[PDB]
DNA sequence: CTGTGGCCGTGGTC
DNA sequence: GACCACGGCCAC
């Protein structure tokens, strides 16, 4: 299979490198003939003679048109003949494309900003990660000597651990007597030893957890101190550290550096993303955490270094195990998008969609629309109306069915052929007209995007069917992640229509999808209520919770299935309402905030403080215990004993202050904030103290006893000392616990005074 | 930075 | 005290 592609320049000429594994053998294929190009639409074919002669300059080098080729293509489905302009080197295109566009005989140019190596994969029809090829994988991690107040990587690496199917080992330069620890003389020999292990094992995949932003950068600094050529690349190269957005990403040429952290971070919803939390979440087994402060003391005092080596060995072991489970998912995504696993595992959803569309457009002889310039961008900054959210019938409900449309917006796009190339196109026999917004969409031929979402939805449903029929809970959980990723991807094609930077931007298409969605859900609500006597309790965008008041579970389920058959017979195309769940009880607080319990006893909470990262653990812990007492049982009086059990304690300072930390992210330069909340107030002080605050920084703070603004008496939890500080017990009662649980316990007649 | 809809505490205004 | 914008995170 194809692992990756890039290009190098030899004597001014580009050379594509295709990194392959075939029949167990790694190969580098070199392609010296593939040429960069872009397209030009001319006022008249004869003008190509002048365009051929346009030249530019590129760092002392004259840039010229190598050769030209007239080709027949389509733009948004409409045929048009253009000129394919070839060049010698990819960097020729940015140097000359403006001068060609400015030429009076050139109407417009296209596809002039496509990365050369990805252009190769598309135009050659190559798809990475295709084939029955078994890839050799190796995980690794490092333990370092950390002292606070030091620059990055000022201390040495103490241990390098690695794990594969044959086991896990640890390399260190102190004498630890464990069977899996290899002792060397120096930090230098340790690094050189690890380099040797990788070259000998020759793995196709190097698995890390956050290696993009810690492990490789640490190794780089230490190798620069020690004078080590850290030639992990299969071409003898060192790891290529490059900027990606607001952080970094690391390539190892010829291999796939699979950094699990970006994948895990967007696939699983967790309060924290330590390696320990991720391992237990996936496999349901604990992993002990040894902290940097313990590692340093063990190394300096030589005491209990076995525990550090075990922790390091376990880091590599669980990293390998996690990589085995998540590579297949990312490998499928690589095939769907048609780009390398390295790229798809790290790229934004917009790039995935666009790389996908550029390939499909090439397959269909469709010219890609250009990205917008600054002027067009400013024109695309309007919004549009979205989904319909019903105000809930707040309170406690029983025998509730949840009906929900399958892949609604993608199904709308498929059903009504919602595409920029079908919008208000004249001459067609048939049209679908969007409600409210009135946009018309030709139905005579499949639209570009509509013709592509079908296969994604097909693949997802196949996964979901396999999932539901999977015995192993771990495999099932991974399939759940898999189908959910395609769900989010498919829905991102809708959002792509309203994405200001999109090539195939179409805000009319976007607001037509949402308009149809609002029509379908409100029609379904009216239909289930008027024809089947249901009561709709709450609805959001494309699903609703409903019951028959007074009916038992058997009856509600039966009549729900009857409505589904009826409504699904009326719905066109790919629109289908699904039976998504039955719940014995359910409590709805506001829009987007409710909790339901199924017949097995599993509670599902949405939007409530229990699920929010920016609320105090004691407030979430309390609301959870409250809901459990209400839904799982029926003992409202028990709920009120837990809460008064918590107000008392907080009053007595018997609650661990660790349950009082508030986490809130900094999202911008501190100068750019208009309003200073508690987390910004703390952040501004830390920066004054020299701490360096960047967007993405999380502020973990606690509120101390006082009366002024919250931010005034808020400090980082790193500075909390119970000897000197008494937290604001009345804040965490009146502002964290009570407000969360009161909104629920209202319905049972309780007020805040009866909970304190 | 795929999209819109929404809650709610905070710290301002009057 | 009523009110509002901000800001963060969450449901679709
Ligand atoms: N991340 C998102 N980006 C864009 N639109 C979204 C996103 N999440 C939800 N939506 C929109 C499009 C969805 O069709 C619609 C209803 O959401 P939802 O029911 O969660 O998903 P779905 O209908 O696409 O999948 P499913 O088959 O699981 O119901 O809301
Ligand atoms: Mg839904
Ligand atoms: Mn659904
Ligand atoms: Mn749905």
Ligand 1 atom index nearest CA of A540: 16
Which nucleotide minimizes the distance between its C1' and the CA of A348? Answer: B1
DSSP codes of every residue in A481-540: HHHHHHHHHHHHHHHHHT-TT-TT--HHHHHHHHHHHHHHHHHHHHHHHHHH--EEEEEE
Identify whether the C-beta of residue A341 lies closer than 8 Å to the C-beta of residue A329: no
From A100, A111, A97, select the one nearest A50 (Cα to Cα). Answer: A100
Per the entry, the structure determination technique was X-ray
- The stretches of A272-348 forming alpha helices (DSSP H) are 275-283, 292-301, 305-337, 341-346
DSSP secondary structure letter of residue A671: G
Identify whether the C-beta of residue A308 lies closer than 8 Å to the C-beta of residue A294: yes
CA distances from A716 to A270, A496, A668, A686 (A): 22, 40, 19, 9
Q: How many angstroms does the Cα of residue A102 sit away from the middle of ligand 3?
A: 50
**C-alpha–C-alpha distance, residues A386 and A518, integer Å:** 8
Could you say which residues 553-592 of protein chain A have a Cβ atom less than 7 A away from any atom in strand B? 589-592
Query: What is the set of domains in chain A, with CATH numbers?
Result: 1-130+348-368 (3.30.342.10), 131-347 (3.30.420.10), 369-446+500-585 (3.90.1600.10), 447-499 (1.10.287.690), 586-756 (no CATH)
Residue A695 CA, chain-centre distance (Å), reads 18
Q: How many helices and strands, by DSSP H and E, does chain A display? A: 22, 28
Q: Residue A414 is inside which H or E element, if any?
A: helix A408-416
Which residue CA neighbors atom 21 of ligand 1 most closely?
A: A407
**C-alpha–C-alpha distance, residues A743 and A605, integer Å:** 14
β-pairing, A78-86 with A37-42? Answer: antiparallel
Tell me which nucleotides of strand B come within 7 A of a protein CB: 1-12
Which nucleotide minimizes the distance between its C1' and the CA of A408? Answer: C12
CA distances from A530 to A524, A526, A568 (A): 10, 6, 16
CA distances from A63 to A66, A100, A115, A478 (A): 9, 12, 19, 51
- Print burial letters for A148-185: b (CB count within 10 Å at least 16), e (below 16): eeeeebebbbbbbbbbbeeebbbbbbeebeeeebbebe
The torsion angles phi and psi of A155, rounded to 5 degrees, stand at -90, 160
Could you say which residues 658-697 of protein chain A have a Cβ atom less than 7 A away from any atom in strand C? 663-668, 673-675, 677, 679-680
The torsion angles phi and psi of A184, rounded to 5 degrees, stand at -125, 180
How would you class A537 by CB atoms within 10 Å of its CB: exposed for 0-12, middle for 13-18, buried for 19 or more?
Answer: buried
Ligand 1 atom index nearest CA of A490: 24
Query: Ligand 1 pocket check: which of A387, A402, A491 to mutate, most ligand atoms within 8 Å of Cβ?
Result: A491
Q: Which two tokens stand for residue A186?
A: 């120096």
How would you class A286 by CB atoms within 10 Å of its CB: exposed for 0-12, middle for 13-18, buried for 19 or more?
Answer: exposed
Q: Which two tokens stand for residue A195?
A: 């380099």
Q: What residues contact A594, with CB distance under 8 A and at least 6 apart?
A: A392, A538, A545, A586, A587, A588, A605, A606, A607, A608
Question: Residues with beta carbon inside 6 Å of ligand 1?
Answer: A 404-409, 487-488, 491-492, 494-495, 541-543
DSSP codes of every residue in A435-446: TTT--EEE-SS-
Which nucleotide minimizes the distance between its C1' and the CA of A711? Answer: B10
Identify whether the C-beta of residue A52 lies closer than 8 Å to the C-beta of residue A105: no
β-pairing, A167-172 with A181-183? Answer: parallel
Q: Residue A45, Cβ neighbours under 10 Å: how many?
A: 11
Torsional sign, CA A363, A118, A126, A465: negative
Q: What residues contact A606, with CB distance under 8 A and at least 6 apart?
A: A592, A593, A594, A595
Identify whether the C-beta of residue A338 lies closer than 8 Å to the C-beta of residue A122: yes
Q: How many angstroms does the Cα of residue A625 sit away from the middle of ligand 1?
A: 30
Query: Ligand 1 pocket check: which of A389, A467, A486, A542 to mutate, most ligand atoms within 8 Å of Cβ?
Result: A542
CA distances from A654 to A218, A682, A705, A722 (A): 42, 25, 15, 11
CA distances from A228 to A68, A185, A191, A464 (A): 48, 15, 8, 49
Q: Token pair 């489970």 is at which residue?
A: A325
PDB resolution in Å: 2.1
User: Edge to edge, what strands does the sheet with A13-22 contain?
Assistant: A2-10, A13-22, A25-31
Q: Which two tokens stand for residue A628?
A: 């459990």
Q: How many angstroms does the Cα of residue A25 sit away from the middle of ligand 4?
A: 45
From A649, A154, A113, select the one nearest A368 (Cα to Cα). Answer: A113
Q: Which two tokens stand for residue A15?
A: 């050379």
Ligand nearest to the CA of A406: 1
Q: What residues contact A120, with CB distance under 8 A and at least 6 apart?
A: A5, A7, A16, A31, A34, A126
Identify whether the C-beta of residue A121 lies closer than 8 Å to the C-beta of residue A339: yes
- The stretches of A591-692 forming alpha helices (DSSP H) are 617-627, 636-650, 678-688
Distance A212 CA to B2 C1' (A): 25
Which nucleotide minimizes the distance between its C1' and the CA of A594? Answer: C11
Max Cα-Cα span within chain A: 89
A540 touches strand C (CB under 7 A): yes
**C-alpha–C-alpha distance, residues A643 and A657, integer Å:** 17
DSSP secondary structure letter of residue A625: H
Ligand nearest to the CA of A485: 1
How would you class A44 by CB atoms within 10 Å of its CB: exposed for 0-12, middle for 13-18, buried for 19 or more?
Answer: exposed
A383 touches strand B (CB under 7 A): yes
CA distances from A41 to A74, A76, A85, A575 (A): 12, 15, 10, 40
Ligand 1 atom index nearest CA of A408: 14
**C-alpha–C-alpha distance, residues A336 and A652, integer Å:** 58
Identify whether the C-beta of residue A172 lies closer than 8 Å to the C-beta of residue A158: yes
Identify whether the C-beta of residue A126 lies closer than 8 Å to the C-beta of residue A118: no
Q: Which two tokens stand for residue A319?
A: 């990293």
- A249, A718, A617, A651: CA torsion to nearest 10: -170
Which nucleotide minimizes the distance between its C1' and the CA of A742? Answer: B8
Which residue CA neighbors atom 9 of ligand 1 most closely?
A: A491
Q: What residues contact A329, with CB distance under 8 A and at least 6 apart?
A: A263, A267, A478, A481, A482, A485
Q: Which two tokens stand for residue A731?
A: 């804040």
The count of C-alpha atoms lying within 13 angstroms of the C-alpha of A481, restricted to the half-sphere facing its C-beta, is 22
**C-alpha–C-alpha distance, residues A110 and A102, integer Å:** 13
- The stretches of A169-304 forming alpha helices (DSSP H) are 187-201, 215-226, 260-267, 275-283, 292-301
In sequence order, what are the beta bridge partners of A700?
Answer: A663
Identify whether the C-beta of residue A162 lies closer than 8 Å to the C-beta of residue A139: yes
The torsion angles phi and psi of A426, rounded to 5 degrees, stand at -85, 165
**C-alpha–C-alpha distance, residues A528 and A567, integer Å:** 9
Q: Residue A145 is inside which H or E element, if any?
A: none
A387 touches strand B (CB under 7 A): yes
**C-alpha–C-alpha distance, residues A85 and A95, integer Å:** 14
Q: How many angstroms does the Cα of residue A408 sit away from the middle of ligand 1?
A: 7
A539 touches strand B (CB under 7 A): no
Distance A641 CA to B3 C1' (A): 44
At residue A368, the 3 state secondary structure works out as coil
Q: Which two tokens stand for residue A437?
A: 């917004």
Could you say which residues 350-369 of protein chain A have a Cβ atom less than 7 A away from any atom in strand B? 350-351, 353
A272 touches strand C (CB under 7 A): no
């Amino acid at each position: 299979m194809i692992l990756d592609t890039d290009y190098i320049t030899e004597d001014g000429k580009p050379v594509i490198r295709i990194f392959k594994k075939e029949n167990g053998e790694f190969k580098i294929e070199y392609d010296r003939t593939f040429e960069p190009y872009f397209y030009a639409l001319l006022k008249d074919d004869s003008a190509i003679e002048e365009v051929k002669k346009i030249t530019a300059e590129r760092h002392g080098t004259v840039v010229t048109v190598k050769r030209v080729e007239k080709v027949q293509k389509k733009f948004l489905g409409r045929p048009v003949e253009v000129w394919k302009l070839y060049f010698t080197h990819p960097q020729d295109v940015p140097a000359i494309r403006d001068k060609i566009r400015e030429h009076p005989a050139v109407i417009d140019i296209y596809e002039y900003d496509i990365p050369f190596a990805k252009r190769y994969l598309i135009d050659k029809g190559l798809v990475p990660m295709e084939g029955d090829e078994e890839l050799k994988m190796l995980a690794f991690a490092i333990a370092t000597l950390y002292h606070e107040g030091e620059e990055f990587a000022e201390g040495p690496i103490l241990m390098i651990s690695y794990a594969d199917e044959e086991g896990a080992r640890v390399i260190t330069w102190k004498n630890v007597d464990l069977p899996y620890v290899d002792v060397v003389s120096t930090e230098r020999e340790m690094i050189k030893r690890f380099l040797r292990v990788v070259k000998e094992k020759d793995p196709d995949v190097l698995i890390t957890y956050n290696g993009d932003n810690f492990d490789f950068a640490y190794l780089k600094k230490r190798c620069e101190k020690l004078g080590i050529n850290f030639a992990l690349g299969r071409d003898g190269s060192e790891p290529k550290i490059q900027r990606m957005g607001d952080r970094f990403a690391v390539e190892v040429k010829g291999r796939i550096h699979f950094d699990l952290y970006p994948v895990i971070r967007r696939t699983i919803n967790l309060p924290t993303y330590t390696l320990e939390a991720v391992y237990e979440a996936v496999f349901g087994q604990p992993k002990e955490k040894v902290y940097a402060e313990e590692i340093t003391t063990a190394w300096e005092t030589g005491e209990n270094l076995e525990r550090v080596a075990r922790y390091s060995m376990e880091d590599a072991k669980v990293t390998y195990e996690l990589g085995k489970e998540f590579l297949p998912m990312e490998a499928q995504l690589s095939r769907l998008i048609g780009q390398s696993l390295w790229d798809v595992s790290r790229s934004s959803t917009g790039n995935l969609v666009e790389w996908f569309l550029l390939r499909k457009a090439y397959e269909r002889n469709e010219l890609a629309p250009n990205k917008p310039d600054e002027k067009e961008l400013a024109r695309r900054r309007q919004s549009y109306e979205g989904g319909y959210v019903k105000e809930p019938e707040r309170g406690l409900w029983e025998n509730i069915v949840y009906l929900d449309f399958r892949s609604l917006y993608p199904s709308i796009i498929i059903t009504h052929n919602v595409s920029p190339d079908t919008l208000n196109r004249e001459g067609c026999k048939e049209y679908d007209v969007a409600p409210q917004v009135g946009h018309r969409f030709c139905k005579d031929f499949p639209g570009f995007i509509p013709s592509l979402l079908g296969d994604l939805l097909e693949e997802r449903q196949k996964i979901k069917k396999k999932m539901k029929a999977t015995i192993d809970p771990i495999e099932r959980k991974l399939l759940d992640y898999r189908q959910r990723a395609i769900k989010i991807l498919a829905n991102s094609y809708y959002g792509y229509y309203g994405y200001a930077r999109a090539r195939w931007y179409c805000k009319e298409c976007a607001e037509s999808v949402t308009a149809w969605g609002r029509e379908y859900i409100t029609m379904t609500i009216k239909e289930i209520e008027e024809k089947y006597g249901f009561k709709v309790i709450y609805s959001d965008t494309d699903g609703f919770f409903a019951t028959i008041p007074g009916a038992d579970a058997e009856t509600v389920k039966k009549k729900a299935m009857e409505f589904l058959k009826y409504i699904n017979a009326k719905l066109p195309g790919a629109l289908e309402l699904e039976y998504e769940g039955f719940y014995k009880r359910g409590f709805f607080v506001t829009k987007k905030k409710y909790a339901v319990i199924d017949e097995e006893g599993k509670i599902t909470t949405r939007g409530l403080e229990i699920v929010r990262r920016d609320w105090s653990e004691i407030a979430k812990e309390t609301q959870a215990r409250v809901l459990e007492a209400l839904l799982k049982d029926g003992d409202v009086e028990k709920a009120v004993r837990i809460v008064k059990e918590v107000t008392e304690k907080l009053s007595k300072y018997e609650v661990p202050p660790e349950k009082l930390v508030i986490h809130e992210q900094i999202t911008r330069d501190l100068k750019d904030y208009k309003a200073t909340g508690p987390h910004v107030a703390v952040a501004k002080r830390l920066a004054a103290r020299g701490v360096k605050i960047r967007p993405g920084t999380v502020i973990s703070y606690i509120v101390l006893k006082g009366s002024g603004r919250i931010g005034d008496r808020a400090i980082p939890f790193d500075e909390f000392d119970p000897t000197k500080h008494k937290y604001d017990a009345e804040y965490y009662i009146e502002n964290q616990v009570l407000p969360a649980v009161e909104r629920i316990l209202r319905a049972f007649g309780y007020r805040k005074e009866d909970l304190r």
